[PDB]
Each structure stands twice: as structure tokens, then as C-alpha cells.
Design an enzyme around this catalytic site. Structure first.
Site, mmCIF file in Angstrom:
data_model
loop_
_atom_site.group_PDB
_atom_site.id
_atom_site.type_symbol
_atom_site.label_atom_id
_atom_site.label_comp_id
_atom_site.label_asym_id
_atom_site.label_seq_id
_atom_site.Cartn_x
_atom_site.Cartn_y
_atom_site.Cartn_z
ATOM 1 N N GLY A 16 -12.199 -21.183 -24.139
ATOM 2 C CA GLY A 16 -12.747 -22.503 -24.496
ATOM 3 C C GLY A 16 -12.145 -23.507 -23.522
ATOM 4 O O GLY A 16 -11.901 -23.133 -22.379
ATOM 5 N N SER B 265 -9.467 -15.825 -21.058
ATOM 6 C CA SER B 265 -9.797 -17.083 -20.379
ATOM 7 C C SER B 265 -8.752 -18.183 -20.671
ATOM 8 O O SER B 265 -7.579 -18.048 -20.291
ATOM 9 C CB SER B 265 -11.246 -17.450 -20.713
ATOM 10 O OG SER B 265 -11.645 -18.541 -19.842
ATOM 11 N N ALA B 266 -9.122 -19.232 -21.418
ATOM 12 C CA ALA B 266 -8.116 -20.249 -21.809
ATOM 13 C C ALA B 266 -6.906 -19.637 -22.515
ATOM 14 O O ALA B 266 -5.768 -20.076 -22.282
ATOM 15 C CB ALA B 266 -8.713 -21.308 -22.729
ATOM 16 N N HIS C 131 -11.404 -16.147 -13.805
ATOM 17 C CA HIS C 131 -12.711 -16.235 -13.172
ATOM 18 C C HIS C 131 -12.592 -16.705 -11.723
ATOM 19 O O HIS C 131 -13.323 -17.597 -11.265
ATOM 20 C CB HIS C 131 -13.653 -17.105 -13.985
ATOM 21 C CG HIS C 131 -15.093 -16.845 -13.713
ATOM 22 N ND1 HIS C 131 -15.518 -16.074 -12.651
ATOM 23 C CD2 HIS C 131 -16.211 -17.222 -14.378
ATOM 24 C CE1 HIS C 131 -16.836 -16.013 -12.655
ATOM 25 N NE2 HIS C 131 -17.282 -16.701 -13.690
ATOM 26 N N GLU D 77 -13.726 -12.074 -12.662
ATOM 27 C CA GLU D 77 -14.327 -11.996 -13.984
ATOM 28 C C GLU D 77 -14.106 -10.646 -14.651
ATOM 29 O O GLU D 77 -14.111 -10.560 -15.881
ATOM 30 C CB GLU D 77 -15.823 -12.267 -13.849
ATOM 31 C CG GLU D 77 -16.457 -11.551 -12.649
ATOM 32 C CD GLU D 77 -17.950 -11.360 -12.807
ATOM 33 O OE1 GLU D 77 -18.555 -12.083 -13.629
ATOM 34 O OE2 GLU D 77 -18.514 -10.477 -12.122
HETATM 35 CA CA LIG Z 1 -9.747 -21.702 -16.715
HETATM 36 NA NA NA Z 2 -12.240 -22.571 -20.189
#
Ligand SMILES: [Ca+2]
Ligand code: NA
Ligand SMILES: [Ca+2]
Ligand code: NA
Ligand code: NA
Ligand code: NA
Ligand code: NA
Ligand code: NA
Lengths: 233, 233
Positions: free
Chosen positions: A92, A125-126, A162, A191
């Protein structure tokens, strides 16, 4: 130390386009959590609709054979972390997530549960960014202001998830970070990459390469299976 | 108020690819500064090599008929701002720039010189972001941590420079900001856009359109020449 206690699975991206949520990493989730974990504690704070996020994560984890509790449904998030058997922090906005971890007093509690009590941690990710020393190399917009960019420090280096091969390019933006004083390495996870950290060992897994940036040095490039233990110390 | 005192020229991007530094905006720089300004004070802090940056900016401003002083060559940056006839803040990393403005005590001094004494301000890219209420909608990586994301507040709204039509898309990232409480409008300036603010009047100039985001509303789209005075109050 970390040797018998740290277990991390740090995923770059939660969903391959066209694939399912956590599908490309599901085998390494199964191997990482095993059957000694029955329920996972989810941190949904990177997204605004936490109820919808938790429902989504629960469907996937239940399919894999785990219960899913979301910290945002606990009256006392610190107590939920204290009782967690495993922690998953999803993607997120990284600034929203990090500020929420500080606002809910979870930075110290999660570090304790993972690094002192040995509870496995999954990030995507986050949630991979916040496992690192700091969020200096996030790709996200600063939509809110955490009280520091220092994060969980489960590893002492930075990650750029990413990572993108050539508005500044990604390498140009990382090179500017490395113009700053004493900045640590930046692992560019493309990714398809995930990093498995078991004690003092780190291993690149997945189906894409990772690009390692060191201050003042030409980046070095690394194939899945690559031993990244030297980044840990 | 702002009516007789505020003069801003807020450029999205300094260089069109293939064009010269500040070439696509040079006519509006000439009209904006006039001949009543003889020297411009440059703030180079968004880039690491400040000497090379200042030399570059000086060549362009000298060609346009202005002297160029760089604050990083003054022994007392606050005094340099106090004496400036015009201020130009160039592009680079927005977090590095904003932290440096705080570190050098220039937030209050520049606001004073521009909004109280009527000195014209030019921003480009990162220097346009720092003219706004805050840097929440920068595109740049948080390579250092300013003590706040609040910026010069020369205008009360946010700007997203180099706005990009459809890793979250630009509109997706701005929509997440507008999920946050009481967030102000976000003016998306595409690469060819500049905003001229004269007192209580704001006008979109250049050769590209700008996309205006309001919390809870569908974005509204605007042609060069568009009157944006309503964003000021
Ligand atoms: Ca990031
Ligand atoms: Na993000
Ligand atoms: Ca920007
Ligand atoms: Na704990
Ligand atoms: Na990082
Ligand atoms: Na920038
Ligand atoms: Na001043
Ligand atoms: Na802004």
C-alpha cells in the site's frame, strides 16, 4: 543474535498481473511458515480500506491453511502483536504504513516479537520496505509524514521494491540517495524477487534478478539463488 | 494581503528534452522579472553538486540579462535572501531541497521576502513543490528527512509536477492522498505547464493541459490560459 531468531520473507510485489494475490510466492510462504504456525497476524495499515484489505488477505491465507487476524480489529494492537505466531505486513502506501506503525506503538513491539522471540515475518512491497533500516528508498508518495523514516530494522540495508530498468530513472534516484552521507546498500528487487532471511543467511528467490547498489560503486547484479548473506553481517 | 505582494512563476519542468535549460519558459521569465530586477538569487540545494548547478543556472540567467547569485556561496544565506531582488529555486530532489531550506533557516526568510516584501519567486520542479503548502505530492524519493513536509506555503494547494497520464499510476497515487483527512486540491501540471500567480490571480500558461484533483470529486481538466484564481481564495 540473529542466528536462531530472525526469519523474514520479503516479497517485492504481492500480485503478478494476471496471477492471484500472493500466488507467485505461495510455495515459499508454505515452506517459510510450515505447520507450526496456525494463525497469521496481518497489518493492513498501508491501505485506506482496512476492512476490505483484511478480508482479501484472509481469503488467501485461509486457502493456504492459516487463520488470519488483522491488527485493526484488535482493541489493543500491541497485545495482538505480543500474541502473534507470525506477522504479515502487506503493500500500500509506505508512508501511511510507517506512520501507522508509529501511531499504534508497533515498531518496538514488532521488532521484539520478530528479532527477540523468533516470530516469522512476511513483508510485501510497503511491508518489505518497513522491514528494512528505513523507508528512504520507497517509490511511494509522502501522503502523510511519519515521525522518522527509520523503520523496523529487521535488516540493516535498504530495499527498492519493484526495481525498474531504464523524470529521473530508478537508478538515478538511487544514485542520489547514495550521494548522501554514509548511506547503506540498496537492494533493488524486481517484481519477481523475494529475499529469504534465516538468521545470518539471506537468499534471493523467485524468477527475476536483483540489482545491488553500493555507495560510490558500480551496481552489481545478482541471479535468483544468489547468496546475499554478506549484506547482513 | 496577496493582492499587491505575491508574484510567482511556478514551472513544472526546467528542460524540454532536446531544448535548452529554461528555454520553453524564457519569455514568461522575461515578462515576469522585467528590467526592474537586476540579479536573481538562486537556491541550488535540490542537487548535490551545488557549484556545478549554480554555474549552469548563471549561464542561462546571464544570457537573459540577469546576474545570478547562489545562496550556497553566501556566508549568510538568510542575509542573501534578505537582500534578494528575485528568488529562483531549481529542480532536483524535493526532500533534499526542503530539508536544506529548514537547515539553513530559509523557510521564514523566503516567505517574508516573497509574501511581505513582494519579491518575485520562480520555481521549477522541486522548487515549484516547495512553493506550495507542502511536499506531500512530490514524485521524488525520500532520500533525506526534512523536519516537516510543510513548505513555503506561497499558495495553499498542492502541485504534482510532471503529471503523467496512465506500480500505482499518478492518479492512483494522488487519489490515496485524497483519502487522507482534509487534504487540499492537487494541481497536476504536465511537463509543459507553468502557473503564473499575481496577487489573487492564477493563470495556467504553456502548451500542455493541467489536471485538477479535488478530495472526493472527479478530476476536472484545464486548458492553457485557464483561470485558476479560485484555488487561491
Ligand atoms: Ca515502494
Ligand atoms: Na506502495
Ligand atoms: Ca516532484
Ligand atoms: Na512484542
Ligand atoms: Na529500504
Ligand atoms: Na525532483
Ligand atoms: Na527575509
Ligand atoms: Na505540493
Amino acid at each position: 543474535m540473529m542466528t536462531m531468531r530472525r526469519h523474514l520473507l520479503l516479497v517485492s510485489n504481492s500480485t503478478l498481473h494476471g496471477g492471484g494475490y500472493l500466488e507467485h510466492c505461495q510455495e515459499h510462504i508454505l515452506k517459510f511458515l510450515g505447520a507450526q504456525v496456525k494463525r497469521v497476524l496481518f497489518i493492513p495499515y498501508a491501505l485506506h480500506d482496512r476492512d476490505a484489505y483484511a478480508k482479501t488477505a484472509r481469503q488467501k491465507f485461509e486457502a493456504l491453511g492459516y487463520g488470519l487476524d488483522s491488527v485493526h480489529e484488535s482493541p489493543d494492537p500491541v497485545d495482538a502483536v505480543k500474541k502473534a505466531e507470525a506477522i504479515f505486513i502487506g503493500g500500500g502506501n509506505t508512508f501511511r504504513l510507517l506512520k501507522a506503525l508509529y501511531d499504534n506503538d508497533l515498531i518496538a513491539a514488532i521488532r521484539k516479537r520478530v528479532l527477540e522471540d523468533g516470530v516469522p515475518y512476511i513483508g510485501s512491497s510497503a511491508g518489505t520496505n518497513v522491514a528494512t533500516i528505513s523507508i528512504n528508498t520507497t517509490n511511494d508518495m509522502p501522503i502523510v509524514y511519519p515521525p522518522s523514516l527509520k523503520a523496523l530494522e529487521l535488516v540493516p540495508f535498504n530495499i527498492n521494491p519493484h526495481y525498474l530498468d531504464p523524470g529521473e530513472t530508478r537508478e538515478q534516484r538511487i544514485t542520489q540517495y547514495h550521494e548522501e552521507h554514509d548511506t547503506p546498500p540498496v537492494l533493488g528487487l524486481r517484481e519477481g524477487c523475494f529475499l529469504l532471511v534465516e538468521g545470518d543467511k539471506a537468499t534471493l528467490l523467485g524468477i527475476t534478478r536483483a540489482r545491488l547498489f553500493l555507495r560510490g560503486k558500480n551496481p552489481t547484479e545478482h541471479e535468483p539463488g544468489h547468496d546475499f548473506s554478506f549484506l547482513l553481517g
